[PDB]
């Protein structure tokens, strides 16, 4: 059927992570950036580890607001760099002005802004496990600011929505049994525990 | 197994399985084995008697080293059926051999199998 | 005989193409496995160990068989399965040293089977292109391997495309009198290599 | 003629229920869920009762408003919820982050949402009579949340309007002569009433 | 004679198809009429008992035939009704027991024939195909009944298709010396039996 | 394999119609033999119970195989016999008791073998159509079976058509270690069956 397929299986939109920028109290800043990633939860891990190789696009919406569910007309920018490139270090540094370094603007009260990104690998396709001798699959970051001139006193809390598409895998894998422990590494726990349920006989049922 | 891993992350499914049973013992060892299935709705047999008279089939894994059985249909959702292992002969040694056995149950599924309705996994990690 | 083909297609592109004998394991009533890195294994042994070494680039297929020699009065069972891209994983400094890692032509014993030593319930490694063996059926398992990989032509002394794992499911028993260790043999014969 | 139709008596747009999510005085919780029904109303249960055998989709519309006719610019959460699945319990709670429960985003001054629903059932058609042996018929939830991290002190009123598309009926049966009492049942009153108006005589009229 | 197909539609797909003649039932000048399950009216007598309280799937069409027996010196009207998904309500537990939701092969006796138990003006119950029984014109009744249902193939001891319901609407009287009784019997014969 | 019809002739007149097992005899060193009537054998199981003792009259024929299970260090023979009309008698109140003329499904141990239980040699029982069964060739025996009668349609639970005789004629032996018991299984197949 349809709904028993790889491409309806990985098709959904889905928080990834949430990003704040604060500019009060201990902390005045205007920037934060984030580092892509698309195992940063563990349901999406266990479910993208069903393969070894995999290739797709990616489409990524914003959702932004303040802390009382209010939204002001306050104008904000976002910034995507590639890999390979320095990243901001400043409210209001000097690579907050690059002709290369893709940035989109949008106000505070308004729909929320929807980009596209293509597929970003110098090989054929990405690798989960790699037997050879911080995200191992670099793609880029992103780069929030407020344009001010100086501080604002408001926080601003922001939500990122990821969406894939044209998506093929490979070969398959078996799932996992144990618990995570650490990012990027398979290390596991040294207690043991069994994948099935427990029963009192090898005779006996309910 | 991957069919009760990949069935939690539906609702609905129906169709048929197959179970196949393998045995690792000495080549001079001999006897025979019952295999029953009772359909869903039913009480579990008391004897080898009962079993006998349902969907059955015999063994002698001294002249076959597998054997394989097909469930007709079962459907699920979100009081389903049960197989039994009874002995018929006991088992039969030449001497100065083990007189220990193991089996395998390799289970899976069939051609006609669907899943209906997506949902989140609960066995998490 | 039952000779079963990875993924169904061959590589398909004298000196260095022959058949090499292993060394023999020991198979006891206590044992838990072996596994080798099959891009290594012969990194140190022959012909085809010099030209990896010295050549930047690497690719080939592979044809492996294992054998065994017992008798009428043995019992057991073993599993032989193929695992692209083996990484090992170490229980709790997060780091496993080089032995596990990169083991030399006589492989590593596994340590935790029923995880695999990597968190997979080895309930489910036959996806993977596996074979059987048991004791009173046949002896012998053939494996063809084509050159699975992202990028084409890759190193030979810094990656590891695959391994091979062997894992006694059911253990070996016996009687009074009889040899309380069957041997086991591997032998490899690279098929469409390049350099 | 066309008006005496099967197609146009059902195809129309009506209440269905009202839905108050309340963050003030006693009372401080974010969310609030309503289980779907279509005989929530006795005239609706009338009209709906003429039938046994029914098969259709649903249109859903939503309006918000605050308690005085006001529309300001706060962010809110609409989340659909299949059947056969956990329902949230806590203004912040796990469920409010998956990839399987279709949820929408819209502010409180913009045009209402509007939303489709397929025909969801196990079998060809709905039931209202059953003669073998919390609504019956059961379609799902809906999750409403304000977007914000502390309580806010004000409340939120919401109504919700159907509309039923493609209806086939099958097999008819007499109307409704006694009064309502119960839900999910046809017990009635011991107090029988008569279904015509009452006449002095067999003889006389006006 | 005048028999009416259901619908217009028969069913269309030795031993387990006869007639069966149920117990009599006596009429008096009091009384309101009786009705009967049509899944289960046949579960506990003759093989269909047997194969159907084992079987646990089932679907069948029926037909119905009832007979009266009187005089010309008697006088009373009948109406014969064939109800699908007949549900009885509880007046004021709100949950009626076993006994009247299923009756054995006897029937149950109406309690409040007006609403026809159920709330419903039984001046309407006549989009049903239903048929009439006058003392002066005939004593005789035929039904055909297809298997109507949402879902195929469904059980036989937890689900009720349908049911059958005869109500006085004229009351019966007589004058001295005649019979103050007349019977009337009830057959059935399953048609197109599937299990 | 080796299939013997009994002379020469097939009877040739889904649920009853299907193979029955029925229970495992354990053979010792020291044993006689068993035997079954087989009209009665059947009379207690399966739908071919029911319908046996409930109709009057009754005709089939049979099929029958006999399996044993047995290693490569045993040693022995049997034989196994069809008898057409196998009256027992008592040896000196002249009336053998229920038990021995109608035993149930298990069967009755003989009592007398060398006279067969009857006043028969025992070397002379090969005029019927008997079959081997050596310990050291093969390990089963398959019997055809008409309806032989003198009278058509006769009773079922009145009449004993024939009996079937199972002897050891060489002594069961072994040596120390080896299993003290073989079994011997028995399974039955009405065929063209009428009532």
Redesign the interface.
Known sequence: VNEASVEHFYSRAGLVGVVEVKDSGTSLDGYTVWPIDVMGFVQQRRKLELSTYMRFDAEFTFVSNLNDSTTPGMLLQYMYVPPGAPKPDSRKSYQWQTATNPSVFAKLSDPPPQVSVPFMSPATAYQWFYDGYCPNNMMGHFAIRTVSESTTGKNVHVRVYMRIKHVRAWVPRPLRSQAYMVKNYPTYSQTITNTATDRASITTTD | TMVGQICRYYTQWSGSLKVTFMFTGSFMATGKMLIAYTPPGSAQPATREAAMLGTHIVWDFGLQSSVTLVIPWISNTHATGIVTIWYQTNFVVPPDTPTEANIIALGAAQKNFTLKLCKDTDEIQ | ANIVLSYGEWPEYVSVNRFYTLSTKSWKTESTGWYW?FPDVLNDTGVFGQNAQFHYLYRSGFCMHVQCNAS??????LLVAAI????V????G?YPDFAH?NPGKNGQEFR?P??LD????L???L??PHQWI????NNCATIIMPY?N??PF??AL??????LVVIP??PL?????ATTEVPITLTIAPLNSEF
Chains 1, 4 share one sequence.
């Open positions: 890195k009428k009065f043995h019992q057991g069972a692209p891209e083996f990484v994983a170490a229980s709790s997060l890692t935790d029923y995880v990597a968190g997979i319930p309930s489910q490694a996806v993977f048991n004791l009173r059926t699975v992202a990028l890759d190193s810094n990656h590891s495309n695959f391994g499911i059911s028993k016996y009687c009074n009198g």
